[PDB]
Structure formats: C-alpha cells, structure tokens
Ligand binder design. Structure first.
Ligand SMILES: NC(=O)c1ccc[n+]([C@@H]2O[C@H](COP(=O)([O-])OP(=O)(O)OC[C@H]3O[C@@H](n4cnc5c(N)ncnc54)[C@H](OP(=O)(O)O)[C@@H]3O)[C@@H](O)[C@H]2O)c1
Ligand SMILES: NC(=O)c1ccc[n+]([C@@H]2O[C@H](COP(=O)([O-])OP(=O)(O)OC[C@H]3O[C@@H](n4cnc5c(N)ncnc54)[C@H](OP(=O)(O)O)[C@@H]3O)[C@@H](O)[C@H]2O)c1
Ligand SMILES: OC[C@H]1O[C@@H](O)[C@H](O)[C@@H](O)[C@@H]1O
Ligand SMILES: OC[C@H]1O[C@@H](O)[C@H](O)[C@@H](O)[C@@H]1O
Ligand SMILES: [Zn+2]
Ligand SMILES: [Zn+2]
Lengths: 357, 357
C-alpha cells in the first residue's frame, strides 16, 4: 500500500510503499477515507515536535482520520462502519494506569505514543489497524468531513476542564476570546457560538491584512476580529472588554502569560498551543495579583479521548453548513497530495482523500 | 470604647476612643474576645494593601475575630452565642449580584469592602455590630482560638476551587508542597496532613537558619523543610520530587510562575499570596509547554464565605493540640497590645485579647 511519510534527515513529505497491515485479536482493519492536516503536523515535518518510531527510517504522518471498517475481525464492529480513531496508544513498555483507567489523554511524557506524531506511525496510508476500544463509530453522513471530529474533540476536552475549574461558584460568562485564526481557533470560535453557556460577544485574534478569508469567517460568525499588531492581548480590555473565557490556540508563549490581564474577574484561560522556546521580561507582580485578587484560573489541555469524540459528533451537527464549506479550503486526492501541505494565508483546513465510501 | 487603629500619615497602631455602636435591624451587638494578626494586617499598616474608609482619619484594624453576642436585637442569634464574623460587606453604593447570590468572596475590586482591610473599620474594638447573615456560630469550646477560623476558611475555599479544577478526571495526588512558613502556610500544612485526599509526602518552603521554631513545627508534622536559598522552587523536582499540589503563601511573584516547573503532570497550584510589584525574565516557553503538555492548572483564590467558615470548625477539631499550642506564640491583653505587632522570626501567630467569656 501507499503511505505519506517524512524520512529521517529529509524535509518534505514523500510517498513510500509498505505492506498492508493485518489485524491482531481485538483489532479491526480500516480503509482510510480522508486524513486532515493541522499545525501540529507541520511542526512534526519541521522537527519542532514529536519523534520517529524506534528503529524506523520514517514516520507515516496524519492523526485526524476517518475510515471505513473492511474487516471487523473478532470485534463488535461491523463491516462498513464509519470510524474515527483516537490518537494515543500505549508505549513500548506496555499499558499503564492512564490506559487502564481509560484516561490516556492525561498520561505524561514518555507514557504514551501518538499516532502520526510521536513514536508510532499515523493514518496517511491506504489501510490501518486499531483496537476496537480506540475506534469511535460516527454517523455515516459525517464521513466526508469526519477528519474534523478529532480537532472538535480537542476543544470538547479543553472546555470540560476549563468549565470544571469554575464549578465551585455560580459562573455566568458573556464574553469569549479565541487567540489564533488557524483551523483549531476557527473551529473553536464556531463551537463557542453554539455553546450552552450563552456567550453574547465573541472575539478572535489574528495578524492578517484584509482581504483575508480567515477574517471573513470571523465576521460572518458575528465575531470581532482583533489584529494583534494593532491591539496586543494585554490592551484588549481598554479597547474592547474584559473576557470571561479565553482559549489560546497560537502557540505563542507571550499569550499564555498576557491572557491573565485580558481576563475578567473570575474568568478562566484554556491553553492549547504547542509553544516554541521564548523568554521575555514579565511583570510577574501583575500576573500574580490578578490571579489571586480576582479569582482567576489558567488550565492547560492536550489530546482527548472517546467521550470527547462522541460529544464532537453532536457538536458537528450544530455547526453552520456555510462555515464547514468555508473552513475546508481543499480536499486533495492522493495523486496531488503535496497541495495539502501548502501553508499560505488562503489555505485554512486541508485534507487528503485516499478513497471514497 | 477603645479601639486599635492606624491613622492617616501615621506608621504604627495606636489606641483611639470611639462610641459603642448600636445595632440596626438585622444586626447583633458582639463583644470582642480575641482578634488575630496576620501578614495582610502588617501590609495594611505599611500602606502596601487596602485603604481607609471614605471621609475617616483612621482605620480600625483586625479581620480575624471571635466574639460573644451580647444583644441579639431582632435576629435569630441568642445571648452568649460565640460567633466569628465574615470579612466582606457591600460597598457604599449598596448590594450587588455577588452579595445577592451569597458569593461576596467572588466580588471584584470596587464591589466590596473588607472590614479591617479596605474601606471599612475592622474588629479590634471592644464591641462591634454585624448583620446576622455574616455572623457564623461556632462551638463554644473553640472560643479561645476562634480567631483561627477565618484563616482556616481561606484554605477551605482555595482547596475547594483547586480540587474543582481537577474534577473532570481521576486525580489521586500523593505529594503536597506549601510555599511559605508564615501563619497561613503553617496552618495549611497541618490541614493537608489531615486532608481526605491522602497526601503521603508533605514539604514546606522557607528561608530560615536553624534553630527556628517554624522549622520545628514543619518537622514535627513529619514534613520536609525546604530552604529556598539552597533549593529554589524550579529545582525541587531534581532534589526531592514533583509535587501534585502546590499552595503558594509567600506573596513572592517568582513563586507564582516557577511553581509550574515544580508541579507533577496533571497537578494544580493554588495561589493565595498578595504580591508586591516585581519583574524578571521568564522562560515563557517552558511555562507554556508544561501547562499544556502536562494538563496543569493554576488557580488563584481570595477571601471566603459562610460555608468555608462552617467547614473550618470541623477541620479545627482534627488539628493536633500540640500544633495549636506551638503556632500561637502570644496572646496579649489590650494593655500590651503593641507586642502583638512584633514581627521577629520567633513570633508566629499572635492575637490581642479584649475580654474573656
Ligand atoms: N493541545 C492540543 O491537544 C493540540 C491539538 C491541536 C493543535 N494544537 C496546537 O494548537 C495550535 C493551533 O493549532 P492550528 O492547527 O490551528 O495551528 P495553526 O494553523 O498554526 O494556527 C495558529 C495560528 O495562530 C496565529 N498566530 C501566531 N502568532 C500570532 C500572533 N502573535 N498574533 C495573532 N495570531 C498569531 C497564526 O497566524 P499566521 O498564519 O498569520 O502566522 C496561525 O494562523 C498549534 O500550536 C498546534 O500545534 C494542540
Ligand atoms: N488570598 C487571601 O484571601 C489571603 C488571606 C490571608 C493571607 N493572604 C496573604 O498570603 C500570604 C501569607 O500570609 P501570612 O499571614 O502567612 O503572611 P506572612 O506571615 O508574611 O508569611 C509569609 C512567609 O513567606 C516567607 N517567604 C517570603 N519570601 C520567601 C522566599 N523567597 N522563600 C521562602 N520563604 C519566603 C516569609 O519568610 P520570612 O519571614 O523569612 O521573610 C514569611 O514567613 C501573604 O501574602 C498574605 O497577605 C492572602
Ligand atoms: O501532540 C499534541 C497534540 O497535537 C494535536 O494536533 C493532536 O490533535 C492531539 O491529539 C495531540 O495530543
Ligand atoms: O485582603 C485580601 C485577603 O486578606 C486576608 O488576610 C483576609 O483574610 C481575607 O479575608 C482577604 O480577602
Ligand atoms: Zn491535531
Ligand atoms: Zn487574613
């Protein structure tokens, strides 16, 4: 079968050939339909995040996948089921308490692999296998955009933890601010529009000149576009308003620290970005004082698990159809796979199509 | 009646004379027994925190109080009830949603007064009044050390919020690290020893040379004393271990930021300190990366309310008797009130006695 991989020392994705895998007991064989590309994938290709499997000269890319079950083997899945795989798997040493208690998304560094990212091959191959417990059935009509279930699930987890942090008092937020206008930030903005908490005012930070299709999406959702070159995060309360909820999806470490100044009293910031190294002079006193005197919280979140994927299938149905059309700028057949890895301003969410249902 | 106050421009507490107050409808008259002194009081005297009541030349000090009801007026309290007052009261403008929903501890800057601290006279007077809703009845046998109920309640709130932040997954901590060896830090250390979460290893940060009575208390509780001059917070995981729970009670802003490096994966830091201004160069990337990739949280907390005071009466009963004896280094009659404001290394928790039951 064909697969899309990065090779050691090499800089770009290439096609390689590999044998079709065979499922072990408890595993199904899945034929890949479509696999998305996100900012983490680009960082993996560049060497900034993740790592190769032990003793392999390559890493098959891709972690946002949807496929169709072609051999259920000895599992309770059925032929033709549409499934989305979870990303984390036990490391070489074997299972541990995080996997045993069904919370691998909470496992620390060195106690997991992530398929397509660290220590294990991803899903950009014509076929893959996985244990049934890590395959989430989704409605058949979500198959075409089913690679979106994974990134939606990321936000489902982050919101669960951020909201838990505010559960000891009566918190009623009215404003939310998403930092970043990438595919995660834009998806999250749309999710916040339909969130049960009832946000009245939505804002999204970016650094683009008009005309720009990410700006168009933000404004079409009735949110306010904030240009960080004009209005830095710490200045936002003066120009706009204090934000009850902040979701950081830039990977820029200054935003992690400055978010505390933009937060309203009793607010929470959720941090999702995978950051680069960075040092600067911070007013630590201002950070400290705001956290304490105004009962603020900062919560970091990574990965997600089955319950979050399930929740994502419900959230998907609530998202506007125009939005899903505008977000996905290109779905490319395997013959033109290279195009999926373009990263210009007019490219938002891309995917590669391996096959159709 | 006599009261202990700081005067505008003046630098030390002095005795002043004031009329005995008369309770309005819904208020009781309370005869003060004992009033504690903490680090926040010292900061109030020095001008670093809080502020005077509008149009007054002085501020009566004291926020940690216990008293006996001498006139229940038209309330459901009884003559001779032992009560501890809460600290926050509505501002000049009147009630707001935080007071109406019974969560004044969540009110932001400018939407509350704190008695003895900001905008309203405290409890270091022979008598005071308060609304019944802000008077918490405590067991009569806790009267002598009843000024401890307030600081215990601070920690009851902080733990409620810190633990809420970890409630979306199965969190089982084994190690806790208290930053600071003041009266709040030491009380919190003892509370963590008896906490239901079942901490196995306790640690406390200070910067004292032996012999020192705070070090003795830490070790007598079977905790490990960590000298910040030898082992800074960020280095603690290398020398000792990563900490599941951190409680910051130093008011030093470097600790607010560096705590993230000492936290174990999935851990939380609670921030309580009232900080001074401070700026330094931080590895923001390291802060950001640890928060996200290891699902960490930071929660700030201030003040407390009735439910936390109630909980404190239960926690009080569980604290070792030797500990309460060693913590309270001096209870001073009003005739020697000045001694309560000494701040040498051998002075831990002090109080002033106005009367006895
Ligand atoms: N925690 C998790 O489980 C998890 C899951 C998925 C993704 N992630 C991470 O989350 C982040 C977002 O993912 P993504 O796929 O949306 O990545 P992305 O496509 O790279 O989006 C990041 C966006 O942030 C913008 N940005 C960067 N610095 C900015 C600044 N200073 N001011 C305003 N905007 C700025 C960028 O704008 P420009 O294009 O103009 O530079 C870019 O569009 C990445 O760090 C990714 O690795 C984490
Ligand atoms: N959030 C709230 O609702 C609330 C409630 C009560 C108190 N507070 C605040 O919480 C803090 C603690 O209260 P407290 O009454 O215990 O105050 P405290 O008596 O001043 O205790 C602070 C302790 O921290 C130690 N410390 C300062 N810097 C240190 C460092 N770099 N390394 C190691 N130890 C250091 C000090 O040691 P040394 O004596 O050796 O200098 C001191 O013993 C204060 O900031 C206070 O204002 C807040
Ligand atoms: O590698 C950190 C994170 O990167 C994201 O793009 C993936 O969606 C997550 O599953 C993963 O945990
Ligand atoms: O002023 C901030 C805090 O200082 C503390 O000492 C008091 O115990 C709290 O009631 C108060 O909210
Ligand atoms: Zn991703
Ligand atoms: Zn206090």
């Amino acid at each position: 079968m064909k697969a899309i991989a990065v090779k050691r020392g090499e800089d770009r994705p290439v096609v390689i050939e590999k044998p079709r895998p065979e499922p072990e007991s408890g595993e199904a064989l899945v034929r890949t339909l479509r696999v998305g590309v996100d900012g983490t994938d680009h960082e993996v290709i560049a060497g900034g995040h993740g790592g190769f499997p032990e003793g392999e000269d390559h890493l098959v890319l891709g972690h946002e996948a949807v496929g169709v079950v072609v051999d259920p083997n000895d599992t309770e899945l059925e032929e033709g089921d549409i499934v989305v795989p979870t990303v984390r798997r036990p490391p070489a040493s074997g299972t541990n308490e995080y996997f045993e208690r069904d919370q691998p998304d909470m496992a620390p560094d060195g106690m997991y692999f992530e398929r397509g990212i660290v220590g294990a091959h991803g899903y950009m191959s014509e076929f893959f296998t996985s244990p049934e417990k890590y395959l989430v059935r989704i409605p058949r009509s979500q198959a075409e955009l089913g690679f979106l279930i994974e990134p939606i699930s990321i936000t489902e987890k982050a919101l669960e933890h951020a909201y838990a942090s505010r559960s000891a008092f009566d918190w009623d937020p009215s404003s939310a601010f998403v930092l970043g206008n990438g595919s995660l930030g834009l998806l999250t903005l749309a999710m916040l529009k339909v969130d049960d908490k009832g946000y009245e005012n939505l804002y999204c930070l970016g650094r683009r000149d008009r005309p720009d299709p990410t700006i168009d999406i933000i404004e079409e959702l009735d949110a306010t576009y904030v240009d960080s070159r004009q209005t830095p995060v710490e200045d936002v309360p003066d120009v706009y308003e204090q934000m009850d909820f902040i979701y950081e999806a830039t990977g820029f470490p200054k935003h992690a620290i400055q978010s505390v100044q933009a937060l309203a009293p009793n607010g929470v910031g959720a941090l999702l970005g995978v950051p680069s190294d960075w040092a600067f002079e911070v007013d630590a006193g201002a950070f400290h004082r705001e956290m304490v005197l105004h009962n603020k919280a900062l919560v970091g979140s990574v990965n997600s698990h089955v319950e979050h994927f399930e929740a994502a299938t419900v959230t998907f149905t609530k998202l506007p159809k125009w939005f899903l059309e505008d977000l996905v700028t290109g779905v490319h057949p395997l013959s033109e796979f290279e195009a999926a890895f373009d990263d210009d301003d007019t490219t938002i969410k891309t995917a590669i199509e391996f096959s159709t249902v």
